[PDB]
Amino acid sequence: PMFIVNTNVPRASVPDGFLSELTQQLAQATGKPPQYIAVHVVPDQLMAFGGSSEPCALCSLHSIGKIGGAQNRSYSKLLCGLLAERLRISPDRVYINYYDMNAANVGWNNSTFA
Amino acid sequence: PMFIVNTNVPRASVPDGFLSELTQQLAQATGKPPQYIAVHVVPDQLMAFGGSSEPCALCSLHSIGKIGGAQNRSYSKLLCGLLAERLRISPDRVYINYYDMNAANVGWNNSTFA
Amino acid sequence: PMFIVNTNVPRASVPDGFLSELTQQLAQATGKPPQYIAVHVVPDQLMAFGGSSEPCALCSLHSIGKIGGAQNRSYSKLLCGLLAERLRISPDRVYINYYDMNAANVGWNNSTFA
Ligand SMILES: *c1cc(-c2ccccc2)ncn1
Numbered sequence: 001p002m003f004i005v006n007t008n009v010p011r012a013s014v015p016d017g018f019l020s021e022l023t024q025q026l027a028q029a030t031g032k033p034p035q036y037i038a039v040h041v042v043p044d045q046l047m048a049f050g051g052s053s054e055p056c057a058l059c060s061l062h063s064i065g066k067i068g069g070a071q072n073r074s075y076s077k078l079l080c081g082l083l084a085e086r087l088r089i090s091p092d093r094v095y096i097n098y099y100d101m102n103a104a105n106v107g108w109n110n111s112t113f114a
Numbered sequence: 115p116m117f118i119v120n121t122n123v124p125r126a127s128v129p130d131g132f133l134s135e136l137t138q139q140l141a142q143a144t145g146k147p148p149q150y151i152a153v154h155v156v157p158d159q160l161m162a163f164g165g166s167s168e169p170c171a172l173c174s175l176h177s178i179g180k181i182g183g184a185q186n187r188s189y190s191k192l193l194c195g196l197l198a199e200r201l202r203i204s205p206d207r208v209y210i211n212y213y214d215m216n217a218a219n220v221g222w223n224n225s226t227f228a
Numbered sequence: 229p230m231f232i233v234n235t236n237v238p239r240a241s242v243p244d245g246f247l248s249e250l251t252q253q254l255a256q257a258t259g260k261p262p263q264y265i266a267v268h269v270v271p272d273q274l275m276a277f278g279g280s281s282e283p284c285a286l287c288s289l290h291s292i293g294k295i296g297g298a299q300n301r302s303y304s305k306l307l308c309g310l311l312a313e314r315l316r317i318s319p320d321r322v323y324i325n326y327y328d329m330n331a332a333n334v335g336w337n338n339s340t341f342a
């Protein structure tokens with residue numbers, strides 16, 4: 001899976017080991033090996049949520065399968081928990097786009113996963 | 115509605131009030147309360163459009179419904195209008211990718227909108 | 229095509245003519261005029277791939293119109309090739325999401341391509 005978070009929370013407020021915590025948690029939740037999980041955190045963004053510049057996050061999780069209603073609710077609880085606990089972002093100021101990628105539509109190591 | 119603009123225009127050239135103006139205008143255009151709207155502007159990017167590093171923008175608009183031919187033409191007029199007026203980017207150097215999101219595939223406040 | 233690369237490689241490691249090279253290579257590869265091609269490179273990112281902060285890249289390629297397994301494999305070879313040669317990123321640490329956009333879902337010049 002690939003998880004991306006953009007946030008107006010400053011770089012200094014992202015704790016040491018945050019990317020490794022995301023990776024571990026996503027491995028558990030998706031059932032995919034940690035070795036293939038990609039994570040990307042973008043602090044200091046110029047963003048607003050509901051017209052407010054209070055802390056917020058705009059996120060995406062791309063996965064080949066493992067995407068659907070119940071699974072997505074679970075990822076949201078996990079991911080909002082993490083952002084709240086670690087970045088001090090209110091869960092109601094977090095949007096996460098979930099994408100079910102087709103294996104043919106993903107490149108890696110000079111080809112696709114088709 | 116979530117609107118993201120990535121641009122080579124420098125941060126100093128993004129006028130005060132820009133994220134609020136985006137929010138307000140998108141609220142007006144989508145028929146959604148401003149409380150739901152997320153906006154994100156990323157200046158100072160290393161980008162080229164059509165072989166040139168003149169001001170340009172690559173944007174996305176994600177919405178749960180309210181995406182379609184005529185609606186998208188209307189958004190494009192509005193958003194290119196604002197980018198030109200406020201960031202001095204030529205409309206023919208703006209791409210906006212429109213995404214119709216399923217409520218099940220959007221996380222928020224520990225759950226989804228499903 | 230629109231090609232976006234996010235990487236933990238420092239900006240100083242991105243060669244001077246890298247945007248122009250991506251543009252040219254994508255034009256030559258897709259048989260498409262370079263005037264429509266957009267390229268965006270985002271260095272210095274806080275990211276991890278398999279829990280590791282060794283050089284990696286998360287990329288997307290958007291086209292209007294299908295890219296089959298054949299085209300996608302061919303793009304991946306080209307693009308990972310360039311990333312390895314120019315940014316010294318191992319191809320097994322590159323992900324590329326491919327998106328087939330509908331013309332009506334792409335805004336440009338105050339309207340859409342529909
Ligand atoms: C998790 C995610 C992926 C992947 C690769 C590229 C684009 C989206 C998702 N692959 C394996 N594991």
Ligand SMILES: *c1cc(-c2ccccc2)ncn1
Pocket residue numbers: 095096097115116146150151152176177178215220221
């Ligand atoms: C507008 C946009 C959204 C949203 C949330 C998550 C991901 C994409 C878009 N929700 C409500 N209103």
Ligand SMILES: *c1cc(-c2ccccc2)ncn1
Pocket residue numbers: 209211229230260264265266290291292329334
């Ligand atoms: C390559 C890519 C595109 C394009 C334009 C707008 C949005 C996505 C892709 N057009 C021509 N050539």
